Design a protein around this nucleic acid. Structure first.
Ligand SMILES: [Mg+2]
Ligand SMILES: [Mg+2]
Length: 198
RNA sequence: CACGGACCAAGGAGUCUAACGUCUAUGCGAGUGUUUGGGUGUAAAACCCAUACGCGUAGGUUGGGG
């Protein structure tokens, strides 16, 4: 999967675009495609990471930050790792969501602000997110590339949902400032993106 | 900047007393302390007497402040 383009704008298979009368694939057929989509995602994206590790100056300096840096520096480094290649670096996306969940209010707010900036940079579509089972033209003849893309869309929808969970728990925080900031982030997302608007 | 933080009001981790001794000030001085009692008293007082016992007593030369 190319990294130079936002992963929604990457051209899908043509078979996605003239398949509206396709028979409903059974759950096993959807499950196998969902699995095959998964293995292709944590496939070459690793090889992309292996290519990334070849640059020793780039890997070492960032690994030092990801290991020894402060929370703000780590949040930044993780945010960039997602901007450069959001599709490939599911590990950094998971890591970012993990900072949002800690007991530390200041850092969790910073991490969630970083996620909000990532979401509201156009990374999320103009349209809503689709689950893997709800993708159009879901077929056995779909290529690995498009299949990985659909799996990543399902994964990112789950990511947004767990981010909403983190918002909900934090939105009831006793501290007034935390509640106000969470409210501001919620209304920013609601105004500027369609995902989970309800 | 690095690290932590429901909210307001309060409250919030033990006592009197003894024995010996150094120094200083005051009174007296081989004395010193009374009050153990009494008198007296514009009355715990203040002023005064004894009454005992306690603790005390029982040269040579050189230098030498003066
Ligand atoms: Mg003599
Ligand atoms: Mg002489």
């Amino acid at each position: 999967i190319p990294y130079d383009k936002p992963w929604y704008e990457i051209p899908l298979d043509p078979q996605v675009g003239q398949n509206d009368d396709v028979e409903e694939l059974s759950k096993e057929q959807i499950e196998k495609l969902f699995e095959r989509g998964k293995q292709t995602l944590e496939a070459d994206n690793q090889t992309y990471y292996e290519e990334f590790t070849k640059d020793s100056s780039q890997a070492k300096f960032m690994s030092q930050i990801l290991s020894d840096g402060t929370l703000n520096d780590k949040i930044s480094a993780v945010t960039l790792l997602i901007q450069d290649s959001p599709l490939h670096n599911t590990k950094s996306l998971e890591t970012l969501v993990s900072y949002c969940g800690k007991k530390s209010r200041n850092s969790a707010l910073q991490s969630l602000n970083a996620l909000k900036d990532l979401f509201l940079n156009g990374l999320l579509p103009n349209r809503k997110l689709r689950y893997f089972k709800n993708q159009p033209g879901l077929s056995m003849m779909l290529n690995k590339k498009t299949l990985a893309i659909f799996y990543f869309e399902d994964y990112l929808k789950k990511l947004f949902f767990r981010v909403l969970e983190v918002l909900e728990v934090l939105s009831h925080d006793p501290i007034i400032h935390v509640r106000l900031q969470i409210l501001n982030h919620v209304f920013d997302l609601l105004t500027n993106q369609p995902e989970q608007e309800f």
